[model samples]
Target chain A: HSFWCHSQLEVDGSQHLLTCAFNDSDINTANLEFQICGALLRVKCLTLNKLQDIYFIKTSEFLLIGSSNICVKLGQKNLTCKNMAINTIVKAEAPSDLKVVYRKEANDFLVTFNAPHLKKKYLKKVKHDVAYRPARGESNWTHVSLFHTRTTIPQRKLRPKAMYEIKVRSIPHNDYFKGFWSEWSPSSTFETPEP
Target chain B: YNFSNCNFTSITKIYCNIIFHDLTGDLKGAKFEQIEDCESKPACLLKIEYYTLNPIPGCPSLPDKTFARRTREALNDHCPGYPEVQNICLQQTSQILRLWYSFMQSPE
Candidate 1:
């Protein structure tokens, strides 16, 4: 009956991707069209291109700061519409290259990861949340927040000789780019040195 | 609305980041001022130093009044409360306008 959409900012050049699909898997979307209106720069409306069941538009038209009215249409008739803020629906690319190494001299586990947005044309700023916990205690996780990829967890913070799990995720920094946190990176497991 | 988390200084920094390149290049001729009083309402006014144009084709330019009005509308709509978030939202809208303006002015 309805659809869901999410935005990927600055994925291609300066253009952003707004992709949507029907909630029901078997719904026929071949004749339907998607169009976005309002909160755009210069243009009033832009139609999406359909590729199979996915309907999407890659353009720089999004203002990236306000709510735009997106609608499902059939032959110039509006079937459904909703107003959504581009910043609110953003799904940031997840962090990659997660690594944890014990630095004996520092007496802390060194953590490093890479964010793909750092090298993009826009949406470069992000805040990372690093979470870790002992493999046995699934819910007891320690968390730290930082702007950059590198951080350290003191040896005392973790139990000795316990297998530890570490992972990182990112959210658009508290600025123009805002939305949900990216999915956690592949967990990096390492054994804490016996103290 | 409670905006205890919003910080004004950080918002200004975001604005600076957005307009950094524009201020360094073709639109460098202009100066700006941030005024507290605007249209008898609670809003920040970004005043252009001058209306003088570059007089050259394909150069970037902003129509001060239009931009100001547009930014106010954007602030009212997208930014519901707090000066800090409002300021950042204004900057975001302004950046879009600046980019679109420049693109439209570019030689085809």
Candidate 2:
């Protein structure tokens, strides 16, 4: 008989690493294959598949480990307070009225937004929000936020391996209010060594 | 009028008109007449208020009247005094019946 199983590495912190293992308890030889798939939360773009194979004899197992960046925005800024927080909030912003609040939890900063303004005046709501780390020696604006009233922003999960500047903005309800957006706000930045 | 593309399985189309039968147990003359003669077309105007209570919950150990009162009470429990509940229940029950019919017609 043959068995097949799968596991996923979800984003937890800024940096996420995953390891997979296969075990067989027989004296015969065995062969194993491994593959990985990843997608950006905003752009919906996916990384190319990487595959590898391993052969073992006797009672033995094989292990493979991989690391990728998971880009996620921290805090709530547009949705209702019930859907606030870093995990529940998507990377998108809406043009409805928003109130920003901040808290100092331990050594980290916690920024939050009030519930989304869902009045009929503002139809479409913000649906995407994402954060990206700044590359070394690059001088472009790092932190940014955008809110939309009717339009949809793409989803991209940026790998967090270096220092990042975060920003927030909103899209307005109508085409006439499209160009208007809030100023970029600064966020905490960090980096990790190769493991 | 035209049901060319329509698939009507497990669907019963019923047309009904009500008539007063008696006043306080007084048998006043009351009757019904067919408006059109359409054979094999399935009777259009069917005087079936009695069948309105068709598929009535079985009352093996109780009287029909008692069973009817209990059925009405059960309906009131679900519908309460809210018209919204009745509307939502009707929609939900229709959806459930449609799903059941679809499942019954599905091939194994």
Candidate 3:
């Protein structure tokens, strides 16, 4: 299981940190791994760019940012920057059992799974980020914020009669290893009713 | 998820048996009688044994009986309880037999 980030840094000369959070169902000893490339570096386990209080899903968000000056190739121009905000919230934990069921009433597919265990004291602080690649040439990662919801499953309508694929993973409370991600399941295909 | 790997050759044999049984309506006491051994050597013996006795047709028309049986069994296993398989085999057999008769009547 793994999670990856692919984003274009627009600003230059400004420092940015990437932050990620993880929510675990129960407190247990686990490993976390983090990786940064192309002008980005890991300063510490909990902090990225002098920012403290960073780690897995337990209300604690780790920060990962650009450390040195670098140039980015954008189209025909090369942009230079010092510290750009690359803060991200990454989490890695054992996932709960995934349940997939077919629903005929709504004519849609429903995917449900339990959220990882979280500390009771940080229950209110728990959050989730659901991301997906919509199309080609899109760099901005759109995230849907979620909380201690019983069901981690999201429902989508079967339209255009085509196959769809998506992935899910967890974010740890503090910097452990890099964030662990779940394997992408087989592509699910369904045909939409013709009008 | 981890997928378990096993010997597919044996699985293929079992699948062939299941298909044969399902297509030929239960192999209870069927016997392989060699027609060449008989003195009479009936003209329509092959046809009678194939279309009437066996549920699947056109299988015996092929040169190799083993190959035909294996092919038919595989098809039946892949598409169980499909009536189209039998219909298709009959249609193919009729076309092949018609071509053979026409060739025999034509010039050498």
Candidate 4:
């Protein structure tokens, strides 16, 4: 990844050594570990920013399965990760302006979300997913409905005059790494037709 | 496409369906609306049918790109006689969607 300057993956008998480098101040080089598809690896994060080397030690289980697609995060934003082959560097953060609005006239739910602000780069490789269900009963979240580059738009239609528990999280869906999804913003509620 | 009897639900479906089918468009409403009658089905009846079949994503909720894309394709289906036919159909859908969305945005 970009922030991680020098890194390595050394195999020793059953243990594997994973090392990466970055400016400790610019990043929370505290507890970053391996994540894949969205699942976090069991390895602990390394906080040794003092030695000009950020590394991890692994064993047989260190080897990932098919879809070596792995990544790491500072907090919830998928940032830096490495597998046996590719070195992935994701620079974007989660989404913001997490507001969901109900349009009674339209009888639809509209959500507003934008990628975490970026200074040196453009907002590519980011897509959004809006999950919602009736506020009263089950937590039955829908299969994540994917979206395009547009960050702000209407989510979906709903029952007339019904309360909805809606949540949205953004993730990188571009060429580099189809990295992890951000933590869902705190669940929000909205109702339509004055109900 | 006869939008006659096509109420808000039916009208919006044309736009939302294209989107659900994973169709990509840079401009929000940039391609504009492309509304039409469902061959012979009345808009109101299709609306009713859509609701009945919507509980499980079988009908109205289906990622229906074909409905819109086909119509656009037909209008553009390489006919010398209808050079502007594509534009004609495109405009028709656009006008229809604009009015429908406007009405929805306003309170009666």
Question: Among these predicted structures, which one has the highest DockQ?
Answer: 1
Instruction: List residue ranges in candidate 4 displaced over 4 A.
Output: A1-92, A117-123, A143-157, B1-108
Go through the candidates in order and give each one's DockQ: 0.13, 0.02, 0.00, 0.01
Model 4 lDDT per residue over B1-108, tens place? 332333434333333423222223222344653443333334433332332222332223221222333223222222123322334333433443443344344432
lDDT winner: 1
Interface RMSD of each: 4.5, 28.8, 27.4, 17.9
lDDT, candidate 2, at B29 = 28
Which docking category, incorrect, acceptable, medium or high, applies to candidate 3? incorrect
The residue-by-residue lDDT of candidate 1 on B36-58, one tens digit each, is 22231112212121121111123
Q: Model 2 off-target regions past 4 Å?
A: A1-124, A127-131, A139-161, A173-179, A193-195, B1-108
* Candidate 2 lDDT over residue span A24-65, tens digit each: 435222322233222212222122222333221111011111
Runs in model 3 deviating more than 4 A are A1-90, A118-125, A131-143, A148-158, A172-195, B1-108
Q: Write the per-residue lDDT of candidate 4 for residues A44-153, one digit (tens) a residue.
A: 33332234345443432321111234466667777766543211333235455667765556544556666552221222346677777889877677635556423333
Q: What TM-score quantifies how close candidate 1 is to the native fold? A: 0.63
- Which ten-residue region of model 2 chain A has the weakest summed lDDT? A56-65
Worst 10 residues of 4 chain A by lDDT: A5-14
Residue A109's lDDT in candidate 2: 30
Each model's lDDT = 0.65, 0.25, 0.32, 0.41
What is the CAPRI rating of model 4's predicted complex? incorrect
Going through the candidates in order, state the TM-score of chain A alone for each one: 0.79, 0.25, 0.32, 0.47
